Amino acid sequence: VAVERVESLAKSGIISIPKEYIRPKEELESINDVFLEEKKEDGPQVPTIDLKNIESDDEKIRENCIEELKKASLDWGVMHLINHGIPADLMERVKKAGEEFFSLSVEEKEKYANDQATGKIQGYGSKLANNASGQLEWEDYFFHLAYPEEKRDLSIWPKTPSDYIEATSEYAKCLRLLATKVFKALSVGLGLEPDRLEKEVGGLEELLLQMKINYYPKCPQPELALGVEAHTDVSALTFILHNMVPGLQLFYEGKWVTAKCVPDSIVMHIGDTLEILSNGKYKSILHRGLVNKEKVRISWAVFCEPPKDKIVLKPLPEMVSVESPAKFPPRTFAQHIEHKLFGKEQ
Ligand SMILES: O=C1c2c(O)cc(O)cc2O[C@@H](c2ccc(O)c(O)c2)[C@@H]1O
Ligand SMILES: O=C1c2c(O)cc(O)cc2O[C@H](c2ccc(O)c(O)c2)[C@H]1O
Ligand SMILES: O=C(O)CCC(=O)C(=O)O
Ligand SMILES: [Fe+3]
Numbered sequence: 001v002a003v004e005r006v007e008s009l010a011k012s013g014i015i016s017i018p019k020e021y022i023r024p025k026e027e028l029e030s031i032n033d034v035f036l037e038e039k040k041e042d043g044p045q046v047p048t049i050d051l052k053n054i055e056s057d058d059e060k061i062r063e064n065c066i067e068e069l070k071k072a073s074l075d076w077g078v079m080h081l082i083n084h085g086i087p088a089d090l091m092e093r094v095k096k097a098g099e100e101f102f103s104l105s106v107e108e109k110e111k112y113a114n115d116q117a118t119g120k121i122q123g124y125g126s127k128l129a130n131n132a133s134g135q136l137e138w139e140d141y142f143f144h145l146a147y148p149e150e151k152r153d154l155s156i157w158p159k160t161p162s163d164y165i166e167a168t169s170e171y172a173k174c175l176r177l178l179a180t181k182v183f184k185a186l187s188v189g190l191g192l193e194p195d196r197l198e199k200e201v202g203g204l205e206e207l208l209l210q211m212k213i214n215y216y217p218k219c220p221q222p223e224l225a226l227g228v229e230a231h232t233d234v235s236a237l238t239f240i241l242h243n244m245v246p247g248l249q250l251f252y253e254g255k256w257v258t259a260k261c262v263p264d265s266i267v268m269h270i271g272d273t274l275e276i277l278s279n280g281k282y283k284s285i286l287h288r289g290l291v292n293k294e295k296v297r298i299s300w301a302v303f304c305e306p307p308k309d310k311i312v313l314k315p316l317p318e319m320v321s322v323e324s325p326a327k328f329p330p331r332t333f334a335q336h337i338e339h340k341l342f343g344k345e346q
Pocket of ligand 2: 127212233235304
């Protein structure tokens with residue numbers, strides 16, 4: 001087998017992209033210039049949610065915050081979080097370190113190469129074709145478990161820069177605390193006890209935080225390919241950071257909306273796991289990512305997942321009634337992923 005990285009392809013000189021990266025004719029029609037889309041101020045826009053008072057002593061003020069978070073989650077399922085409590089400089093250090101790692105040569109990064117054939121899913125890689133179509137996406141990435149600390153495999157974490165492990169582990173610790181706050185506000189919104197949702201996804205013991213760094217090289221024909229294909233996140237919650245280069249688009253009310261860059265904010269996605277548990281109340285939105293020919297785009301996504309086999313996911317009893325039948329059958333995290341993959345393959 002040959003090992004092809006998109007970064008190498010982007011530097012091979014080619015002025016035209018391989019056939020494997022061109023989307024189907026029907027899909028190409030919806031792809032435009034990400035820079036112009038970013039400028040449009042008409043139509044629905046991704047909501048910005050302020051979490052300053054999410055845990056305020058003032059009852060009226062606290063409830064107003066919880067209510068705004070609830071509404072955005074029921075409608076969009078995605079949002080720009082501000083006043084989230086995570087130090088701005090810590091985030092700068094995480095991004096700087098990621099940029100230094102991907103700044104190394106491909107040959108150097110290959111020393112961290114993953115190997116799916118033997119179950120080694122953590123490390124440097126690029127998505128391999130997994131079905132008849134043979135479609136490929138314009139991106140490389142690095143994936144690894146970031147929390148709980150005792151479950152980590154530090155041996156595969158970048159050794160360059162020297163502070164990658166230190167900054168990434170502290171950031172992971174901060175996100176874990178923020179997740180607990182979001183889970184409580186969301187529980188209360190559904191009329192459940194404060195600790196209900198986080199408990200159903202594994203609690204402090206079983207809940208996992210996976211880190212995926214997405215690297216999108218410049219593309220010579222940006223309107224024929226996608227950085228990431230259209231999909232919904234299978235996680236409970238997803239927290240993302242980026243390098244102020246536009247690219248994320250959301251499929252809202254039948255149309256692809258382009259997300260704007262909001263300084264010091266953190267994008268949060270409601271994932272399939274919470275959508276299933278709430279029987280469809282909280283939305284797991286369809287989204288994708290565009291590439292361009294002028295700037296390299298990078299993003300840092302942290303997926304909060306429940307144990308893959310230990311828990312059977314299904315609508316909670318309180319969310320199901322004769323008038324509101326279950327919208328999803330019972331399945332584990334692993335079985336859910338397999339079902340989604342089985343869909344496209346078929
Ligand atoms: O490789 C993958 C993957 C993985 O290696 C480890 C893990 O813990 C979760 C994962 O999730 C998969 C997935 C599949 C379909 C989706 O719609 C989606 O959002 C995510 C993904 O393919
Ligand atoms: O969307 C994604 C995703 C998600 O939504 C939820 C989740 O819990 C894990 C995830 O991880 C995906 C992934 C991991 C390793 C890979 O090698 C890869 O190609 C893809 C990512 O794509
Ligand atoms: O790069 C982004 O904005 C997000 C990519 C994405 O959807 C994912 O990694 O699941
Ligand atoms: Fe996603």
